[PDB]
Design a protein around this ligand. Structure first.
Ligand SMILES: Cc1cc(OCC(=O)O)cc(C)c1Cc1ccc(O)c(Cc2ccccc2)c1
Ligand SMILES: Cc1cc(OCC(=O)O)cc(C)c1Cc1ccc(O)c(Cc2ccccc2)c1
Length: 239
């Protein structure tokens, strides 16, 4: 095939998703007049800071979803289970794409730039390695707002999260994003062989992260109290 580009209706969908994304980006991308770095084998420092931005960070993934018509058109019950399943996957994506090879740091909530270790011992553990790997891995991809946005959309519209009722519709919306995405990619023409396949594999990585983080939080879910974690963090990442 000549690799088709967006259709009239897809272009409309792409504009809609990009806007949802751009609007709920932390700053959107000018961690240049914003970010600033952090001066043990636990990091009460890094951790304390994390507890401070983790909330607005989760809040903007919710606000991204509230901005997708298809998503608003879902029963709040599925809307909840859907958000909880892709929350970490979207946050990590958003952080991964802000990896600065120079400073070898990611940028969280578009304000705090952290190192691998800082994030590793600030509460994420090996996940930090995973998101950092993904970050470096993505430089080569060169993704714009739309691609990242579509990616978040695809992650959001996962019909495999247990408890969903409107599974078929969620699958319909997803395939719909996937296609628009695939065509947007046809238009972009990245100088990367097998770019589309290579990309979808990153989604599997973001999913893995999601699962590892879930496993992670539950293992400590109750070795630690809740006096430590922001209420919103708890509403999301505990069963
Ligand atoms: C990867 C990331 C992205 C992020 O927002 C990025 C963005 O969307 O701009 C914010 C944070 C704190 C992080 C790191 C993080 C994510 C989940 C998580 O459970 C932890 C450990 C933690 C858990 C509760 C309180 C503080 C720290 C850190
Ligand atoms: C430097 C950069 C990096 C970037 O990272 C993603 C990528 O480059 O693929 C994205 C953008 C849009 C930019 C630059 C930019 C320049 C002018 C401009 O009007 C825009 C879009 C925009 C304009 C005003 C406010 C927010 C966003 C981006």
């Amino acid at each position: 095939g000549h690799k088709p580009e967006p259709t009239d209706e897809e272009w409309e969908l792409i504009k809609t998703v990009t806007e949802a994304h751009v609007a709920t980006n932390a700053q959107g991308s000018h961690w240049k007049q914003k970010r600033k770095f952090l001066p043990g084998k636990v990091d009460l420092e890094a951790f304390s800071h994390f507890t401070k931005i983790i909330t607005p960070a989760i809040t903007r993934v919710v606000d991204f979803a509230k901005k997708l018509p298809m998503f608003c058109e879902l029963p709040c019950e599925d809307q909840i289970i859907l958000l909880k399943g892709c929350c970490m996957e979207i946050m990590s994506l958003r952080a991964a794409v802000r990896y600065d090879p120079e400073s070898e740091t990611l940028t969280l909530n578009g304000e705090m730039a952290v190192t691998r270790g800082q994030l590793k011992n600030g509460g994420l553990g090996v996940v930090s390695d995973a998101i950092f790997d993904l970050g470096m891995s993505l430089s080569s991809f060169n993704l714009d707002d739309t691609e990242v946005a579509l990616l978040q959309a695809v992650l959001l519209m996962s019909s495999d999260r247990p408890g969903l009722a409107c599974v078929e519709r969620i699958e319909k919306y997803q395939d719909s994003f996937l296609l628009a995405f695939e065509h947007y990619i046809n238009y972009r023409k990245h100088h990367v062989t097998h770019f589309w396949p290579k990309l979808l594999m990153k989604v599997t990585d973001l999913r893995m992260i999601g699962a590892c983080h879930a496993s992670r939080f539950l293992h400590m879910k109750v070795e630690c109290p809740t006096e430590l974690f922001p209420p919103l963090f708890l509403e999301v990442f505990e069963d």
